[PDB]
Structure 1
Amino acid sequence: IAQHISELIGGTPLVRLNSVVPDGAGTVAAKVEYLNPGGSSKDRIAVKMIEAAEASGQLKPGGTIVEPTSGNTGVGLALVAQRRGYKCVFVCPDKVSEDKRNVLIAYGAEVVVCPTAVPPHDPASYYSVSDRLVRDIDGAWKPDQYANPEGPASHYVTTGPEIWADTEGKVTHFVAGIGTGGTITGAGRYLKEVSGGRVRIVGADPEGSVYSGGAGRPYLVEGVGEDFWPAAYDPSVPDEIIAVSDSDSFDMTRRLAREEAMLVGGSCGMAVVAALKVAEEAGPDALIVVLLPDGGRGYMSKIFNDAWMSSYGFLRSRLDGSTEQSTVGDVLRRKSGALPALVHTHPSETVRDAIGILREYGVSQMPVVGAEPPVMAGEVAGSVSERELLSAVFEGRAKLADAVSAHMSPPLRMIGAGELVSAAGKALRDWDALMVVEEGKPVGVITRYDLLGFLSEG
């Protein structure tokens, strides 16, 4: 009977990947680290930092920890701290959802927030506020997980020994995502010390990070990647820092949760793809130990969602089935019925009336089609945009009281309404908007700004 849920931190199992690794290569075992009591793989270093700060006389019983964390180290820190009763005060950027902050609070912490993407160096971002809070309060100890060797020390004393004792020294490679220069450094130091030089320490990294050898970027795989060099990462330990993309990372995460029964996040997918790319230079008789550093239940809205993975350039395929089964004729509903509204302006109505019929229906293009009955055939006189009328009314090239039949652009290209969004996503690659002919009679206008809004939500 353990004395607290904080003693079960460690000894995480080591499962084997069956259906993801391609045939014709060695074994790839995946150290699953999301089974810790804190859910994450960073509660292994939180306990070590707490102990090294208590023993070395820096966190006097009664202090208040303070760390500008994101939401994955905060859980472990809060758990281990509230074991013995240390008030925990965090600092978070707005990029973190409400659910992660609710989790951080449910463990007995106090999470203050500062705006995200603000210049880190100023007193605006969370770094300056964290430093100020550390200075002011008494007893506060900012662990500074980025420049604290205790992280690598813990991953050296309790992660390296496990990966060795569980495989019996017959592990050739060790691929692990490198977010804060942690696991990689400690596990590499250990697996190189007590194995000679047989173990080659590979390291995964999001395509375009400092470690890979690139410049800054906005990141999506929360936890990995960086824009500078943490003082707790020996760049000499690793041997081949692979660089992986974000689409590949998310696809591998999804395929892993689908074919291996592991709900891992983004970093896990990136590490597994790096390994898979490392299982091609070493034939049989090899053993590559990936490290899955997180559990994929907080990402049920980011990756395993089907809209956020298409709000970007991701979503190679739908979560469980057919490619799209969605036609343009469905993009034009927004109410499941709301398309009895072909918005047209005959060739005689004054220009001001056309601009008004645009401003009223919140559209930005329309066919100037005679024969008012919206049942007409392809006999559309032309099209009148909005940015043109408003461009030919303020430059003097046309007056408000004029007839639209002298300031209308040629008709806009058309596509059938009963066709998937794929052909549209390619067709709007040459124009700005196109009509949707439904049985030969126009029924609406599909435009880029609408196509995105649909894809980005459904």
Structure 2
Amino acid sequence: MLIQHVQELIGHTPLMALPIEVPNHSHIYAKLEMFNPGGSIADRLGAYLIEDGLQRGRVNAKTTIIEPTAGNTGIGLALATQAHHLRTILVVPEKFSMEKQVLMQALGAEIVHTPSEEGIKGAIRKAEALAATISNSYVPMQFKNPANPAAYYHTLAPEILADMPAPITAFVAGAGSGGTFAGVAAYLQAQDSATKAVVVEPEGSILNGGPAHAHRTEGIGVEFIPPFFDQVRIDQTLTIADNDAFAQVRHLARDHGLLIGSSSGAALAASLQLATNLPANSHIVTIFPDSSERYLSQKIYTK
């Protein structure tokens, strides 16, 4: 394949039939989003948000994009903005992966650091605050903007179907902003009412009423129920334990050469769990958002 710009490599990621032991002898399919130029499923979102921002006449040549992110979206966004020569300011909460930040910076963005404890909420508050002091500015707001799920709706979703060798029994996915799950579940359920949708979250997330605290799994986890969920018939909301997610990261890497992040491990943990209360010979599809190489600074592969 011959490419001119890096943006061409966004999407069209492989779908792998994990050569692993699945209960009731069913099959789990994962989309290796880490093969995106920026190394995360977020690359898609980023390009799309900026596109939407342009088409809606809310962004121009000298506009200053400001957005709260945990890092991966910041990367996907910085890549897009970089392509359009758009000044970028990313607001990210203090304790997230060093590499994401270095990468964000490396791609040309300017990071604003909010207190670890304030989480995404503080980052969002801070982004909007700054947006109000910068006249020519646009805040994509990936946690509310509908363009978010719309993004995965026309790219990811169709791509999953195209590779699937059979009817998708269920679709498990991790949720950070929710965008990925929603936008894809939306498309899949609207092509087969049967496809059950399942959201996954780390212990310490609110999606299941649990108490709100900090988790070791990174990338997923919510601090308020995501607005993009009324477009999907949520068949079940699973809360995966930290050790469970990481244990999977370790295994997949040691037994099937799969370098996957925690969010990806949590997804696999969830998908394998759902496999038990599902008909035999079923067909589950899930998403691995990024590589474990992105969390090597956190000793991801340690116990």
Normalising by structure 1, we get a TM-score of 0.62
> Is the Cα contact below 8 Å between 1:185 and 1:237 reproduced in 2?
no
Report what 1:50 is aligned to. 50
Provide Cα deviations, 1:26-53, integer angstroms capped at 9, x if missing partner.
1212111110111011111111111111
3-state DSSP of counterpart to 1:185: helix
Structure showing greater relative contact order (alpha-carbon pairs closer than 8 Å, 6 or more residues apart): 2
Normalising by structure 2, we get a TM-score of 0.93
4+ residue stretches of structure 1 with deviation over 4 A?
118-121
1:301 partnered with 2:297? yes
Q: What letter matches 2:60 in structure 1? A: K
Which stretch shifts more, 72-81 or 179-188?
Answer: 179-188
- Of the candidates 284, 294, 303, which is equivalent to residue 280 of structure 2? 284
Provide Cα deviations, 1:312-365, integer angstroms capped at 9, x if missing partner.
xxx2xxxxxxxxxxxxxxxxxxxxxxxxxxxxxxxxxxxxxxxxxxxxxxxxxx
> Is the Cα contact below 8 Å between 1:26 and 1:279 reproduced in 2?
yes
1:217 partnered with 2:229? no
Report what 2:77 is aligned to. 77
Alpha-carbon distance in 2 for matches of 1:301, 1:287: 35
Provide Cα deviations, 1:376-412, integer angstroms capped at 9, x if missing partner.
xxxxxxxxxxxxxxxxxxxxxxxxxxxxxxxxxxxxx
Report what 1:249 is aligned to. 245
Distance 1:14 1:97, change over 3 A: closer
Alpha-carbon distance in 1 for matches of 2:72, 2:124: 17
1:175 partnered with 2:172? yes
Report what 2:3 is aligned to. 2
- Of the candidates 268, 273, 284, which is equivalent to residue 272 of structure 1? 268
3-state DSSP of counterpart to 2:110: strand
> Is the Cα contact below 8 Å between 2:99 and 2:297 reproduced in 1?
no
Distance 1:210 1:98, change over 3 A: closer
Alpha-carbon distance in 2 for matches of 1:37, 1:30: 18
Provide Cα deviations, 1:386-444, integer angstroms capped at 9, x if missing partner.
xxxxxxxxxxxxxxxxxxxxxxxxxxxxxxxxxxxxxxxxxxxxxxxxxxxxxxxxxxx
Query: What runs of 5+ residues in structure 2 fail to find an aligned partner?
Result: none
Distance 1:162 1:127, change over 3 A: closer
3-state DSSP of counterpart to 1:174: strand
Report what 2:59 is aligned to. 59
Q: Which has the larger radius of gyration?
A: 1
C-alpha displacement at 1:208, in angstroms?
4.2
Alpha-carbon distance in 2 for matches of 1:208, 1:95: 15
Alpha-carbon distance in 2 for matches of 1:67, 1:238: 28
**Structure 1 or 2: more helix by fraction:** 2
C-alpha displacement at 1:303, in angstroms?
4.2
Alpha-carbon distance in 2 for matches of 1:119, 1:79: 24
Alpha-carbon distance in 2 for matches of 1:279, 1:305: 25
C-alpha displacement at 1:190, in angstroms?
1.0
Q: What letter matches 1:163 in structure 2? A: I
Alpha-carbon distance in 2 for matches of 1:120, 1:273: 24
- Of the candidates 121, 125, 128, which is equivalent to residue 131 of structure 1? 128
Alpha-carbon distance in 1 for matches of 2:156, 2:7: 17
Distance 1:119 1:23, change over 3 A: closer
C-alpha displacement at 1:305, in angstroms?
4.4
Alpha-carbon distance in 2 for matches of 1:43, 1:206: 23
Distance 1:97 1:45, change over 3 A: closer
Provide Cα deviations, 1:144-175, integer angstroms capped at 9, x if missing partner.
10001111111111111111111155221111
Report what 1:155 is aligned to. 152
Alpha-carbon distance in 2 for matches of 1:84, 1:118: 32
Report what 1:184 is aligned to. 181
Provide Cα deviations, 1:163-216, integer angstroms capped at 9, x if missing partner.
111115522111111221112111111111112x22111222213422123231
Alpha-carbon distance in 2 for matches of 1:242, 1:118: 24
C-alpha displacement at 1:229, in angstroms?
1.6
Report what 1:436 is aligned to. none
> Is the Cα contact below 8 Å between 2:166 and 2:283 reproduced in 1?
no
Q: What letter matches 1:18 in structure 2? A: P
C-alpha displacement at 1:5, in angstroms?
0.7
Q: What letter matches 1:255 in structure 2? A: H
Alpha-carbon distance in 1 for matches of 2:154, 2:119: 37
Q: What letter matches 2:116 in structure 1? A: T
Distance 1:216 1:200, change over 3 A: same
